[PDB]
Amino acid sequence: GFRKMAFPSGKVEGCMVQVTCGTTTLNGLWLDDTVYCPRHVICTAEDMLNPNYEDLLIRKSNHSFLVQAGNVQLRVIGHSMQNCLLRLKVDTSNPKTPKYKFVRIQPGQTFSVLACYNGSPSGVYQCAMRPNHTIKGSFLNGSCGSVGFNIDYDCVSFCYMHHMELPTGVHAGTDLEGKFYGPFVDRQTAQAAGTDTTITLNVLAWLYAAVINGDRWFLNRFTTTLNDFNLVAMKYNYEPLTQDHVDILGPLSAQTGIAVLDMCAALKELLQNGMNGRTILGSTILEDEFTPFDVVRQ
Amino acid sequence: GFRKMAFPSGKVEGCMVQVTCGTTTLNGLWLDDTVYCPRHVICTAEDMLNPNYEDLLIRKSNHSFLVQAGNVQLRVIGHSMQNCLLRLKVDTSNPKTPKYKFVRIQPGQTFSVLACYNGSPSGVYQCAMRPNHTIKGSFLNGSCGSVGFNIDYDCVSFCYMHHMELPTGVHAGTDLEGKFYGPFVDRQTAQAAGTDTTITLNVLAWLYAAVINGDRWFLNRFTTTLNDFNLVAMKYNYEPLTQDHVDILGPLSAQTGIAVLDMCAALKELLQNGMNGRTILGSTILEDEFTPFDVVRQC
Numbered sequence A: 001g002f003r004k005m006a007f008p009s010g011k012v013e014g015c016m017v018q019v020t021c022g023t024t025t026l027n028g029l030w031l032d033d034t035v036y037c038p039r040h041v042i043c044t045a046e047d048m049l050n051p052n053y054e055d056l057l058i059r060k061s062n063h064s065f066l067v068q069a070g071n072v073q074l075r076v077i078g079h080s081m082q083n084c085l086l087r088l089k090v091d092t093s094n095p096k097t098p099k100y101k102f103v104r105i106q107p108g109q110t111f112s113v114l115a116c117y118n119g120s121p122s123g124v125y126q127c128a129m130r131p132n133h134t135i136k137g138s139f140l141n142g143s144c145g146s147v148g149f150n151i152d153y154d155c156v157s158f159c160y161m162h163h164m165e166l167p168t169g170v171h172a173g174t175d176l177e178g179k180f181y182g183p184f185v186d187r188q189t190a191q192a193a194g195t196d197t198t199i200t201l202n203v204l205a206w207l208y209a210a211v212i213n214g215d216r217w218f219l220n221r222f223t224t225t226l227n228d229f230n231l232v233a234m235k236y237n238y239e240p241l242t243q244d245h246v247d248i249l250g251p252l253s254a255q256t257g258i259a260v261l262d263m264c265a266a267l268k269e270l271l272q273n274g275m276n277g278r279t280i281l282g283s284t285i286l287e288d289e290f291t292p293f294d295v296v297r298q
Numbered sequence B: 001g002f003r004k005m006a007f008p009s010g011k012v013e014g015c016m017v018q019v020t021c022g023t024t025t026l027n028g029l030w031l032d033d034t035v036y037c038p039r040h041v042i043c044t045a046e047d048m049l050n051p052n053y054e055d056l057l058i059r060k061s062n063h064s065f066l067v068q069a070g071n072v073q074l075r076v077i078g079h080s081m082q083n084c085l086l087r088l089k090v091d092t093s094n095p096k097t098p099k100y101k102f103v104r105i106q107p108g109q110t111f112s113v114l115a116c117y118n119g120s121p122s123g124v125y126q127c128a129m130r131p132n133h134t135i136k137g138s139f140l141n142g143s144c145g146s147v148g149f150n151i152d153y154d155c156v157s158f159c160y161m162h163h164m165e166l167p168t169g170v171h172a173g174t175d176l177e178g179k180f181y182g183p184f185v186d187r188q189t190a191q192a193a194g195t196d197t198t199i200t201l202n203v204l205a206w207l208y209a210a211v212i213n214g215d216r217w218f219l220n221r222f223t224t225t226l227n228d229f230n231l232v233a234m235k236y237n238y239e240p241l242t243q244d245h246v247d248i249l250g251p252l253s254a255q256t257g258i259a260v261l262d263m264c265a266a267l268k269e270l271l272q273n274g275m276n277g278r279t280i281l282g283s284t285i286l287e288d289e290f291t292p293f294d295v296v297r298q299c
């Protein structure tokens, strides 16, 4: 009784459309009278080596954008570029527009992804912004324009739009202002991320999830200092723990009766001695894509 | 890049309502002018061992059922009992009703669950119907009436309505005709899941996914017949493979060039010799809720 859960996607499904330029098709996000989509929709195998997007956009008209909201075609009455997105103005305002915000998420935070193909939603899953600013998604051909989001009350916080897959199989994209997460550019050329690390704050939160759910085999009577634990974190490619992070784990610490630095001693033991064929919440690996907030909500 | 993915939940979100009888509230599924919900909504510590549902139902008027679709109350116009569900006729037909059907999901097949509380959807996740007819869900108090479903093209196939949690932490419920999956009853009494077994068709799909992903340390050159693999599998509480299962794995065997029965011989050795601390797709435990359809669609 503890698993990856995505937000219900209906508020986002009502905003998904299909945007086509010539032979290139991807998904767009339709909010009020604006459609947001990745700008490389205007590209045709000049995806490579030299996308000069200013040169390629000046040569386009409104008429060269075919935007389809289901059966209906919306007419583009304007267009501008913002960073790596296009903002297409259309004559119709989406009646299904939810209360929404655009936010830029921090590494370690999680969001739900609505994977779309030809404007049509096909799956929903949870994932996280990695410390190296990639995401470990599931995106196939035609998935560009799919969005990541969180929902607070009735408000959809859009945080990700999908652009590309790196050769390691992880993914890269932008916020809804079109600025990439990480060092990447929307050009079909080989690009690497920085070396990733494990999200220590999330592993600790998931260890609290396990205690809350009856898995306590890994606890122990020892404890450790912050710097003592951080020395072990660095050896195993975990990111350092901050007093602010300890402060974030306060509510989970209270509800379980295990001080943060005690859980760190437990984690230190799991890194050093392995898990010895046992499981935690049904997993044989230390899970790092649940935030403290995700654990409390579940 | 393989991961569990749920169907987009919007088509079901627009059908979720709250149903309240006195002190007990749970979720209902509003399609056209019918609201479907577990019948134990009419109970009040009559839940204990022996609710007499026909007795409790005859003693209830339409006005005792408080049905709320978000902001607005819906008026219950009639009601009947179908197996372990109530069917509430309301005066309003749901304008958001999608194309739908009611299906009986089979052991081994997967579906998405929209977990709801007080008629408000809170999360979506994917589930397998286990061979012992339970599901390994994530349901808290108030989750009853949450539904599981698949979506084909534009049509929602409803297959599950949540009723209860068994002592091992797994969950039981019914199809949308109110017939329970498994030998369970909606009575708060001593009940236990049967012995689970492992969904072998899905473990084999997972090994194929691992081969597609470049991991093939577990392959060997032994051969096995279907019958000799099934005899070993049952010794380890694995489901035996059927004729149809071998056919279902055709696409993945063709894609990888590994004959179905050769992957069976790979699995047979894993069952008999363990993993010896090696990992498959990052895990020392064989996943059995990822279907051959999920592997095929995610490649």
Ligand SMILES: CC(C)(C)[C@H](NC(=O)C(F)(F)F)C(=O)N1C[C@H]2[C@@H]([C@H]1C(=O)N[C@H](C=N)C[C@@H]1CCNC1=O)C2(C)C
Pocket (backbone or CB within 6 Å): A026, A040, A043, A047, A139, A140, A141, A142, A143, A144, A145, A163, A164, A165, A166, A167, A171, A185, A186, A187, A188, A189, A190, A191
């Ligand atoms: C994977 C590929 C080698 C093709 C390339 N990657 C690199 O060039 C890199 F090495 F720089 F990453 C790449 O993704 N693109 C090439 C080109 C865009 C993009 C693209 O096709 N986006 C798809 C949108 N529908 C979603 C992708 C497709 C497959 N799975 C996804 O997620 C732009 C960078 C303009």
Ligand SMILES: CC(C)(C)[C@H](NC(=O)C(F)(F)F)C(=O)N1C[C@H]2[C@@H]([C@H]1C(=O)N[C@H](C=N)C[C@@H]1CCNC1=O)C2(C)C
Pocket (backbone or CB within 6 Å): B026, B040, B047, B139, B140, B141, B142, B143, B144, B145, B163, B164, B165, B166, B167, B171, B185, B186, B187, B188, B189, B190, B191, B192
């Ligand atoms: C777990 C409990 C000991 C309470 C009991 N279980 C057994 O009696 C068993 F052990 F027999 F299964 C049980 O579930 N119920 C008691 C009673 C219904 C049901 C119930 O409360 N359903 C909840 C619906 N809102 C969802 C559950 C709650 C907690 N987590 C869930 O999923 C009925 C069988 C009429």
